[PDB]
Amino acid sequence: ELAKKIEEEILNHVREPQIPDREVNLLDFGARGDGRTDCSESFKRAIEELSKQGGGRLIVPEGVFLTGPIHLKSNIELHVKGTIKFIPDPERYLPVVLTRFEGIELYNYSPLVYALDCENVAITGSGVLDGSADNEHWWPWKGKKDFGWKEGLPNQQEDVKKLKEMAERGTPVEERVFGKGHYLRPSFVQFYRCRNVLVEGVKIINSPMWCIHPVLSENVIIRNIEISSTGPNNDGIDPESCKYMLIEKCRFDTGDDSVVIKSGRDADGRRIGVPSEYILVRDNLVISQASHGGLVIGSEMSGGVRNVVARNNVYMNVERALRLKTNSRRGGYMENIFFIDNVAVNVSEEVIRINLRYDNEEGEYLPVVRSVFVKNLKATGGKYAVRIEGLENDYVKDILISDTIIEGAKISVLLEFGQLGMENVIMNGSRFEKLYIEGKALLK
Amino acid sequence: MEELAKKIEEEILNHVREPQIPDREVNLLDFGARGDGRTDCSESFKRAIEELSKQGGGRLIVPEGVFLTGPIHLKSNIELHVKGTIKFIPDPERYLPVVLTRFEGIELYNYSPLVYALDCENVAITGSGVLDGSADNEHWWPWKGKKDFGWKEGLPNQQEDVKKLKEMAERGTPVEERVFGKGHYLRPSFVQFYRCRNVLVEGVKIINSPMWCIHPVLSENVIIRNIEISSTGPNNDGIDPESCKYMLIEKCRFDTGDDSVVIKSGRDADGRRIGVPSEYILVRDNLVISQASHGGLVIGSEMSGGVRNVVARNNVYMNVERALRLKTNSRRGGYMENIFFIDNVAVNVSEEVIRINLRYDNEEGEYLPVVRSVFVKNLKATGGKYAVRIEGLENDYVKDILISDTIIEGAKISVLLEFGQLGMENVIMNGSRFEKLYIEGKALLK
Amino acid sequence: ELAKKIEEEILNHVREPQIPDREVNLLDFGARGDGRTDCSESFKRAIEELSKQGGGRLIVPEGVFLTGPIHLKSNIELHVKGTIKFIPDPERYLPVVLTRFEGIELYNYSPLVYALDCENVAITGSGVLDGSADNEHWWPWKGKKDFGWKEGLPNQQEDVKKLKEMAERGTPVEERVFGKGHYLRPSFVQFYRCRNVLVEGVKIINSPMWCIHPVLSENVIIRNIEISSTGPNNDGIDPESCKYMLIEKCRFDTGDDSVVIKSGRDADGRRIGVPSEYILVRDNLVISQASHGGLVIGSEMSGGVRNVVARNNVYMNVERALRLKTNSRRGGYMENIFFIDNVAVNVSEEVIRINLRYDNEEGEYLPVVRSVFVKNLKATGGKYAVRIEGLENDYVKDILISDTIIEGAKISVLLEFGQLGMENVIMNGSRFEKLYIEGKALLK
Amino acid sequence: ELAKKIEEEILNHVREPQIPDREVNLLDFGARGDGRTDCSESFKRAIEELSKQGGGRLIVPEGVFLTGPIHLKSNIELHVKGTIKFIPDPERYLPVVLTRFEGIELYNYSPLVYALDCENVAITGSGVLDGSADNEHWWPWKGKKDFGWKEGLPNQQEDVKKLKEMAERGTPVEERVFGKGHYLRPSFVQFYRCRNVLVEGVKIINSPMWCIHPVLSENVIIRNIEISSTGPNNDGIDPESCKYMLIEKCRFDTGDDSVVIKSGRDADGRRIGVPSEYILVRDNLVISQASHGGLVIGSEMSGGVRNVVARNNVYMNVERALRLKTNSRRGGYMENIFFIDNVAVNVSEEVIRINLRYDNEEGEYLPVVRSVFVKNLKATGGKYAVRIEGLENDYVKDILISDTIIEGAKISVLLEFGQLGMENVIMNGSRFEKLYIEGKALLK
């Protein structure tokens, strides 16, 4: 069976980064943990000194260290004992760097921790990364009053429209310059085209937008971290066009999707043409009323997503346990998605959701969505246990749910333009030894 | 709530009434008959009916005894009152000359039905006696071609004649030129009213039927009530209303060799030519206890003229193969629609509780049947390989099937659906409760 | 397999009566079938002529024969082809004879067909027994306006009271003379202390009260008859203190209990102390909205009722399928009752009923009610599926329902002071692999 | 809306303790977080300095701080950032103090963190409290080979018997001296006769016995803590004769009952006669195979337990979700216990357990057990769904389970000497609108 094979494959290619046996303390570079001194230059000097010697471990001791963005280099481990608190002043995140906003490449404000074309990079320790985002910093740019936007203040809407247009017209990335005078938030922790990446131990809070965002990266390990940030688009981990990645033993409380697998949006995503594949998500804990999904694929999946195993996770209070979202603007594919031995309780919206009408957007690139496997799920709550919606000319195919119990969902199955198999499934006052349906169905 | 099924039942009851029969009677023993089960009473019946018909009609009393006779030909305003047994002599020669009749939905000239009325008005069969067709493994039944029913290797059967009859109908060969009978092997119906008005059949028991037991054709205002059918031979259908309008079947008991109550309206080209539907048929308060029965309430397969507005209410079906059965295929054309199966009980069903099949006999053609608006409400059922088995065609879905307030237990498969639209509201199926179950397309539920 | 064992035993001791090969025709004794001529004397003379020779067959040909009561003798078969219509004049049913009224012995009006201390007696043929009871004959004596009783006119109430008091006191039966000036209706067909009895073929209509009433009799076959009488206390068949009886292939439409097993009432019943036992009820059809019960035991069960098998019967539209009736005035027992492979559809009250407070009466003779077995019942409808009430000081014991499906009953189980076991039972949305309850229960 | 009324009442009387705006660091008192230095005096000196000024916060920074027992005083906050690791030498926990062992008052070894007759006391921070119990320390005193007891070595058994006898014969608490030469383990964190108590943030591991044990205390908040200790009698939180308490947002993995509400054992409990009442337990997570019960009442309930609301908790892998236990030695009562909007997944023994035969020991004090309410429970697994066992002369009364679904339990209901009501429930795919039983029942 495929799920064990995929896990075995992932585990054969996932490896901790090599970090030179050499360490340096941030205090020796004039930094002060007084939550007052600007430590920007300290980080710059310590990292540059380490990488001239071939790399190494930078120790950030107990205390609160204020800084602008941190730019990592190859062979560098950032070891956080205290708190790194970022200064929420957009000018500090200039000049513009190569980055990505909601699946489209551009030049924009630096992520708060940024590594480009690097190898063997680590963030470790049991300290804190504090993005300093709140109702007065970064978050108003969303344009939601819930988060500090008001009439007469700028927001991201016009810039998002321009960005989608530029990518539609296939303009070169270098031509897509935002930064100053524009309102597109950066990612928090971003590895861009990196190899051999480790993020462990740390707690992430007050994030501007997406928290951990590896892009076009290979051999990535995220373990034993805590995400606690519930602002607008505060996704937990967004693997985007990544290959061979392990996410384990993490704690999530997110303002949006918790673990969200991506690979670029529309034309830009199809241009790059790199899928996310061989991702293992296991032994994680989501306790989050604000989370939009425990395990999420899309909507930016135009490069494809396949061979994803999510196993032995616990989801509590989330809106959705498993969520796949796409539309006919995206193209691409989502296939061989395994959601196994999970527990999802007090789900508020849909336990399992597959949606091919995301944002009600349409175009001429029909996504392939097939081979999604749910086995040994114990779940509780929801407006829907199972909600699967394809298109008249693009059915959701080969969806199988087995050995599963979902209690207290209002509607058992909403199916439109899909094929669904269920084997040994229990839903409230209904039990299915074997169910197969192709077409449309409503079960409650 | 205002239910259409009630309005249809009302409409049927408003156009159904017992025939007036003149107050006048003669006794069969006054015409040379003997109830010794030996004397040929053929002429006794004929002279008694004519004596009554001469005066303007009345009652013919058949008293205690067993009365041997060839076919009986009724006339208008005649009540055949059966106290004893009428036992029909099973010599095919006795059933000639050929008369206008029907075989499996196609008109022809063939052996007389055992009791026959053509173009008659106000005709009744009453009393608590027996009609005995004398069919068995040595008489009539071997003609089917089945060994368990007396057919022997190298002996004739109906198959070639059925083939020929279908081909003739396809041509457009006039009925007057479709002559069978002598030298051919098509069994006659037992009791047949052909193009009749105001017909009553009540009280009597019917046994040892050659083929279909009660066969009203192109008839209007027909009542069949408090009769017993007990005949389990090949094609022993109980009651076959064929292109009939305004009919009541109530308080009857059935043990049948094929479909118990089967609504029809002609087959293929011949059915389309005549183009008269069976409609406004009420089937209520009946009891079928019959392992052998192929279906409790059946529509088709000869439904080429259409079948609409049929209500089957408060019936009890026991040990039957199927409770409700709709059969058709793409050679048939026509329609089956507005069929109401309400307040019924089915216990120990062996095949399918509810069956809708658009692939009957695995035969195909250019005439796609319309199959829609079938309503099952307040069914309580037990047993089966299938609770619900509904099979349409890729270019002809079964549409608007609704099952509600219904409990089916102990069926192996709950739903087999292919090319259909199924709705269920407030149903329990093998322990699973569904407030709503709507499926369009294909499904298999177990 | 105790039910099979009991059935085998009954079939071993049930045989048709030997009737001498000799016949006589009623027309040769002054009878006319014109529905006008009084044939009372004709029956008397025909039976005497046959009896004189040692017995034989009395032929009643086609026609309608008016008569007072018929008194049968040993070795007589009454073969009925026509209608025997009884003249509903109470004076014709005198002198009083030894008989019974609702479980108590007395001298009263003759049953319409009566046999006392006879052996080898048969009633056969395809004819009709017409008791001529209606709203102006016999039925008014009940005291119900529905059946023709008028204000200020006499009824059975005072005589019933007086009969009960006589029995309580131990008043000798021979001192309990009713008849003229009293309002106790007779049974229709009664065999009193008879042996080797057959009733077959005939239709019974317009019954004054109980239709077929064998008492203290042995080796009785009731076969292929039809009961069609829906007046007050129109019981179908009342085996009372009988041993070895077969009831099969019969059709019932009754105004009270259809088949009901009895053995005397209260002190009279205990004095006699003869149970009804080894009764086989099979292959019967009850189509009857009026019927109070398909198979009933009691309430006159003071001699005991045991070893009763009802198998492969069909009940339609009846108030109850199985009912047990008693109280603490009765004493006695009801045990080893087997209700197997039955079908009961469109039941209006209770599918299965047991109650120990019959007629709001009490005494110091607690009845033993135990070991009732329902197996392979398919049933539909009812206000109750199972309704079992005992007494705080006298539980209903060892009731077992198995391999049974009951659909559409509003309440599944009402249990009050009883022991109930269910194995492999389905009731609407409830399924019981194995249930045991002792005490009180309501299941809905 | 009694559950709602009780929750509101609790929330009116529960509030955080006032702590003086003053602080001190443990390092300033000779402590070293090197995991070798004895910091016993450091805590003693630091608490005293704060106490003398009127109170304040004691900061325990990063590192491992070895210590004997910590004795708190009024107006003290212990803020734990690092690890406090207790030295498992019993002599360090002398002289003996006023404490309890399994519901009986005595003078014994000091709890690891102890406060007697204090006001306004807090334990805060995100650090660790490590009791250092294992198969070689404290645990062997239980007498189980599985937790390190060797044949021929001492255990608690004799001292337990001795303490029972002292409490029964009425000997004063001050004459109940154990400690040295005796084998009764102390509680971990114990507030004795305290008021305005907060425990938050901290992780508790390697506990000698009961982890958090407030006794005879009022206004207690326990929140955002983790218990992770799976030894013998490693209960999580034991409110014993407490009033106005809130337990929320906690995580449990326990070796015995997770949250257990108590009020003394037998004669000693009756002597004191103070119930645990107005306890609110909400938004907690138990993921614990070893746990004996999610929310438990008893067995030491001799002072009574009433008005307990457990709402919106999640129990995973536990032996039992709801458990009430007592016997005829205890007397007292358990009533008005509310178990609402809870989820239990993969229950191993009984989802709901009520037992009046705890330890199979009997006596002359019949416990009142009534008015237990389960609403909107969703549960998976179990040998029993519902198992309720009273006594012949002492029925479990007024148990109501409603709007509840339990799937995958082997036995649905075991009832003995009890009154059980169910409304709108689903058990293993059987639906009951109403299920009421009084007496005995077994349902599969």
UniProtKB/TrEMBL annotation, chains A, C, D:
Enumerate the GO terms in the molecular function aspect. Answer: polygalacturonase activity
Biological process terms from the Gene Ontology for this record are: carbohydrate metabolic process
The cross-references to PANTHER family, in alphabetical order and at most eight, read:
PECTIN LYASE-RELATED (PTHR31339), PLASMIN AND FIBRONECTIN-BINDING PROTEIN A (PTHR31339:SF9)
Q: Which Pfam families does this one have?
A: Glyco_hydro_28
Superkingdom, taxonomy of origin: Bacteria
The protein here is known as Exo-poly-alpha-D-galacturonosidase, putative
Q: Could you tell me which species this protein originates from? A: Thermotoga maritima (strain ATCC 43589 / DSM 3109 / JCM 10099 / NBRC 100826 / MSB8)
Coiled-coil intervals in this record?
none
So what family is this one in? Belongs to the glycosyl hydrolase 28 family.
Recorded hits in InterPro entries, A to Z, give:
GH28_Enzymes, Glyco_hydro_28, Pectin_lyas_fold, Pectin_lyase_fold/virulence
